[PDB]
Design a protein around this ligand. Structure first.
Ligand SMILES: CC(=O)SCCNC(=O)CCNC(=O)[C@H](O)C(C)(C)COP(=O)(O)OP(=O)(O)OC[C@H]1O[C@@H](n2cnc3c(N)ncnc32)[C@H](O)[C@@H]1OP(=O)(O)O
Ligand SMILES: CC(=O)SCCNC(=O)CCNC(=O)[C@H](O)C(C)(C)COP(=O)(O)OP(=O)(O)OC[C@H]1O[C@@H](n2cnc3c(N)ncnc32)[C@H](O)[C@@H]1OP(=O)(O)O
Ligand SMILES: O=CCCCC[C@@H]1SC[C@@H]2NC(=O)N[C@@H]21
Ligand SMILES: O=CCCCC[C@@H]1SC[C@@H]2NC(=O)N[C@@H]21
Lengths: 541, 214, 541
């Protein structure tokens, strides 16, 4: 029996209001700017590299991915803004690698492809970080992965950042071994020459496909062999699809053109013999009752103005149906249950500065969801944190610890979205990047940093004032603005969404309009991994 | 003509979407957004390019999966604004679609390698490509020349130095140490020459008869 | 998504070729001969025993089996050629017992029935072996079993071969206890008198049904009681359906005629409350693209000529669809994935003399299938084995050991078919009888022995030549053919398919035409047992 009608969230924002107009204009400006940049990134290494790559007869990586996936299906690229102005003068579109999740032969699987157009497929440090992030996502979600190797090797001028360290290059192979150990499939496809970077990968993978001419599997390149052993020989003699197939046996299959390799890959995936099963109650799904684009006028591009979360929730969940939990108590925070694309979810969001009561409410909600095996989604807009003499007297920090412990010990899949400004230890509290959320995204407006620039400028001013007063020449009235200005500027630069997305702190920058769609895709993939028991540490009263 | 090519190209997607839909129905989870045939990427408009056989000339059609569900295809600098659907009258399915504001209904019978458009004014014949690797021509290109699997005494050779080669004809009969096996002609091209004479022995993976390039 | 078209195996054999004509004629001759013999076996003990068995009102065993199974369903008799000319002068059709697998009340179950017509239902040594083989099949496949006892007791003139040894008679009861221990059902139905052989069976089984008059359950027969205790009394007083039912309680049900017992058995099977569940992905199945009878002309009745395996595979698998694995490397052996009756299978077959590379390929393939939980099927035609000074230098024996270890440690169901001549240690390598395959069949042409007769004759000639030369009178030029001839003759006799099938080394001799059908039935039954983890020993590099 499901005949009871339920109240729906959200209202109709006043379009005629000048505030809505202003917010809309700001959000359009940001979205347009993002779109133009993404176009320029997708062009890749540049026209000349494309001309040469075509001249060899290979297919450009974007074309390869389009042919590989089940046609007419969505594909979810990740961290497209990697390496955006990260290095001093070297243009590295997309980090010289394309990674994503797609549906192939009816089974979700992660695709990782080199981009030989960009810098000959050399592994920049960011490239390794991006690839490892993809692999860990696949393992947690328990998804098969496919590699499309056209890489040369590690970037020589930066060897310290690539080779030695634990999380550095080579950890890739370790993950590969662990994946194959616990039945997660591995497939490697070779389209280009490889020198010790794409040489172990086919040997490391269970299955192997190599194109007849353009594919060569060799541990040491012809220049490396010539320089090291004093002997020169073409990589085909060390590599080659036919040469390796007849005698070496490294290649399990022998393809002629790029299309043939893709088709064979589809056949292998079908033969993989895996079936997905769910363990959560499912229901029919319906669209939210309100248009999504209104969010622009609701949110704007200023962190100062405040927007109620429930408006956004109405714009997202199925049918705009929501059941708030302990609404009156701890109003600064919002929790409740909802359904997205027929899947149950628990929504946690921020309205204002946290207090002790909000922390207690969040802890109780987390326990409930973990007990009932319900996925969790976080919408954090932490304009301020819990600071105050009365607050610390009653151990508001202790309540914050309760947030941290509950979030950390949780085992159900967790997804986080940074709708608004994130600062302070609340990032740790509301399932930050460090707390291993399955995904993480940021809207084009959000700014993330440890503290607002003004706060740090004031704090530094005071500490210098106190110590220099102890030194006899206190921080003078002059230099106050001179000292403050650089701190504000630097914090602004480090808080920019592109700046963080240049590194891999986030999985991607998404416009608000696409939000709903992305979430559904993510949750579907996350459901592949079976749910497990959640065990909690000591709950300090 | 140009619109007709677009109409068939739409039909392939609709049939493919429906068959994509069918496998979803038998599956456990028929509710995921993945089952949607939207073909949408993140922040990018997905585009796939076709090739369809049109009598003598092949035509390349560029299909951009538009954001709203409309369908955009372009052939020789002419674009076409296409929206369509599939509905079945009786047991036969009709294709109803509008191309640049002009709509019509036509029977869509789809064979293994041919496209059928049936209408009152006439019919249109479009042919889908066949991949060369699936065409088994690639199978004969896997091996450049014949190879003897095992070393053995060649009793006698059925083909002379210059001789016509037929499909299925045996190059020679080679018997060795509790085994006789019969070697065939790898390709129908006329033999350039025969490498091994009568009574000779060739090792594993060794050429046996030279053949002219096909 | 399953829209990609797949290349299909097999071609059209040239019918007009004289070789095809010759091969067809040979195969027809063998099949006809087999059919006539099977007719003669099915007549049973002979007309007079049939007349007497009818006179008592009982139904002949074949009639009983036909009535018992779900009507209009296939039934798979096993080892029909047991005892074929095995003993010196005693005709024992079918080993005096009929065993098989059938579908009853929608549930597969094994039927074992005595044949009181043949030698009064005495247990010949072969009879015990056949019955025990059936029981072990049922336990591995985890199937309920039903007994139809009309046996007198062990054959007195051969008591050494029946009573004492571990695998001898009485082990039946041990298997029965183990089966009932782990919830595998047991049903016993009594139609004839029993003396200590069919006396414990009803007591050993959970359920019991006995016909009113013709059924008597008694541990000691009237002659045994009279000879032993000096007291004579009819077996009805010791047995009897009514007598045992009212007081002894050995009989759980009381039937009037044979039909009534069969009907009650159906009711019990329905009440058994078992449901079959699968754990493998299933797909729609379609017939192979080529007629099966062509195999005759392809194969013939000469071991010298060679036939490519892929022809046979095309004649078998669904839609003649196949995906070869590592085709170019190790060409003498063939492996790949296919589907039969909607079930995934891994095909392993032989084309020629094994080498080291083929062994490595087979080991890798076995690991893959075991990891993905895919059943395995073997088609062995081992004309020759791996022997050679260069081969043994690189440890080709070691690679053969890798074959042995991988096959032995595997846990997925395995089925083997001897399409062609089997010799040497390769029998051990390709899942021989000793390696516990779930089933095993031989075509009418195959010959199995440790070594070809010519080889053993040559070896014996050399060893006698060497030792007698050491003795001063070497093996002369004379007697060479005189010594060789008996060895060749004896090896030919021991290699005959009927000779092996007379014993229980194989489960049955099947014509090639029926091949496909049989396989499907076998695999379906094998799927009842849930799949388990596969653990591998030390992989000696
Ligand atoms: C693991 C190791 O340390 S071994 C590393 C040494 N081996 C190599 O990588 C050899 C160079 N790379 C190759 O040739 C690869 O086999 C290929 C075929 C995939 C690259 O193909 P190509 O594009 O023809 O190679 P090419 O040298 O032209 O690469 C283009 C650019 O990438 C750079 N590059 C490519 N690989 C590397 C590398 N491993 N280290 C540093 N730079 C590299 C080159 O400096 C070159 O300069 P440019 O981009 O300013 O023109
Ligand atoms: C397990 C033990 O060792 S207990 C000792 C064995 N006890 C007996 O079986 C005593 C013999 N009993 C019998 O005569 C029969 O088996 C009966 C009465 C139980 C039923 O058998 P029937 O089908 O009626 O056969 P019938 O009694 O007409 O004739 C006996 C035939 O079976 C054979 N036979 C049956 N049981 C045995 C046996 N245990 N040992 C040797 N021969 C036997 C006899 O050789 C005889 O052979 P035939 O077929 O050439 O005539
Ligand atoms: O006169 C000698 C006959 C042997 C009698 C054996 C006795 S009788 C009761 C008991 N049961 C047997 O099987 N043996 C003993
Ligand atoms: O001349 C006849 C002797 C039979 C040879 C059998 C061959 S030799 C190599 C291979 N190993 C065997 O055990 N048999 C075959």
């Amino acid at each position: 029996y499901h005949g009871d009608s339920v109240a729906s969230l959200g209202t109709q924002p006043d379009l005629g209001s000048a505030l809505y107009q202003e917010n809309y204009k700001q959000m359009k400006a940001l979205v347009n700017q993002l779109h133009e940049r993404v176009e320029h990134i997708k062009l890749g290494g540049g026209e000349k590299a494309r001309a040469l790559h075509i001249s060899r007869g290979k297919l450009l990586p974007r074309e390869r991915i389009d042919n590989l996936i089940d046609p007419g299906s969505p594909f979810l690229e990740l961290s497209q803004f990697a390496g955006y102005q990260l290095y001093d003068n070297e243009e590295v579109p997309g980090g010289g690698i394309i990674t994503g999740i797609g549906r192939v032969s009816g089974v979700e699987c992660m695709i990782i492809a080199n981009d030989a157009t960009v810098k000959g497929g050399a592994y920049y440090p960011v490239t390794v970080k991006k690839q490892l992030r993809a692999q860990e996502i696949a393992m947690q979600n328990r998804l098969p992965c496919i590699y499309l190797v056209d890489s040369g090797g590690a970037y020589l001028p930066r060897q310290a950042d690539v080779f030695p360290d634990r999380d550095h290059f080579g950890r890739t192979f370790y993950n590969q071994a662990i994946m194959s150990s616990k039945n997660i499939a591995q497939i490697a496809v070779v389209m280009g020459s490889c020198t010790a970077g794409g040489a172990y990968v086919p040997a490391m993978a269970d299955e192997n496909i190599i194109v007849r001419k353009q594919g060569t599997i060799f541990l040491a390149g012809p220049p490396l062999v010539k320089a090291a052993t004093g002997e020169e020989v073409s990589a085909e003699d060390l590599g080659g699809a036919d040469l390796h197939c007849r005698k070496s046996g490294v290649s399990d299959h022998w393809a002629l053109d790029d299309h043939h390799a893709l088709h064979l890959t589809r056949k292998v995936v079908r033969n993989l013999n895996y079936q997905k099963k769910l363990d959560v109650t499912i229901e029919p799904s319906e669209e939210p009752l309100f248009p999504a684009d209104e969010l622009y006028g609701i949110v704007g591009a200023n962190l100062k103005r405040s927007f109620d979360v429930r408006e956004v929730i109405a714009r997202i969940v199925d049918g705009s149906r929501f059941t708030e939990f302990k609404a009156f108590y701890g109003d600064t925070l919002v929790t409740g249950f909802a359904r997205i694309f027929g899947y149950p979810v628990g929504i946690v969001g921020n309205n204002g500065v946290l207090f002790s009561e909000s922390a207690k409410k969040g802890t109780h909600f987390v326990q409930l969801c973990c007990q009932r095996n319900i996925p969790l989604l976080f919408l954090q807009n932490i304009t301020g944190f819990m600071v105050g003499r009365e607050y610390e007297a009653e151990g508001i920090a202790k309540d914050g610890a309760k947030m941290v412990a509950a979030v950390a010990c949780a085992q159900v899949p967790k997804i986080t979205l940074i709708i608004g400004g994130s600062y302070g230890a609340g990032n740790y509290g509301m399932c930050g990047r460090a707390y291993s959320p399955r995904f993480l995204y940021i809207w084009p407006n959000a700014r993330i940093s440890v503290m607002g620039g003004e706060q740090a400028a004031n704090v530094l001013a005071t500490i210098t004032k106190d110590q220099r007063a102890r030194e006899g020449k206190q921080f003078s009235s002059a230099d106050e603005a001179a000292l403050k200005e650089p701190i504000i500027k630097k914090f602004e630069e480090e808080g920019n969404p592109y700046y963080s997305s240049a590194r891999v702190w986030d999985d991607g920058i998404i416009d608000p309009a696409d939000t709903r769609l992305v979430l559904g895709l993510s949750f579907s993939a996350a459901l592949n991994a079976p749910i497990e028991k959640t065990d909690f540490g000591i709950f300090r009263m | 003509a140009k619109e007709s090519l677009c109409q068939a190209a739409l039909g392939l997607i609709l049939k493919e979407k429906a068959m994509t839909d069918t496998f979803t129905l038998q599956a456990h989870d028929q509710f995921s957004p993945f089952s949607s045939s939207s073909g949408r990427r993140l922040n990018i408009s997905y585009t796939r390019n076709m090739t369809l056989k049109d009598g003598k000339n092949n035509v390349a059609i560029a299909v951009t999966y538009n954001h709203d569900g409309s369908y955009s295809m372009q052939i020789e600098d002419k674009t076409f604004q296409v929206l369509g659907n599939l509905y079945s009258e009786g047991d036969c399915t009709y294709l109803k679609c509008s191309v640049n504001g002009v709509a019509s209904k036509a029977k869509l019978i789809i064979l293994e390698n041919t496209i059928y458009l049936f209408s009152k004014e006439g019919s249109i014949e479009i042919d889908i490509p066949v991949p060369k690797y699936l065409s088994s021509v690639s199978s004969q290109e896997t091996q450049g020349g014949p190879l003897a699997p095992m070393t053995g005494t060649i009793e006698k050779v059925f083909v002379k130095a210059g001789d016509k080669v037929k499909a299925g004809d045996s190059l020679m009969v080679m018997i060795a140490m509790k085994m006789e096996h019969t070697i065939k002609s790898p390709k129908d091209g006329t033999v350039k020459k025969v490498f091994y004479r009568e009574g000779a022995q060739a090792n594993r993976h060794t050429p046996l008869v030279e053949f002219e390039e096909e």
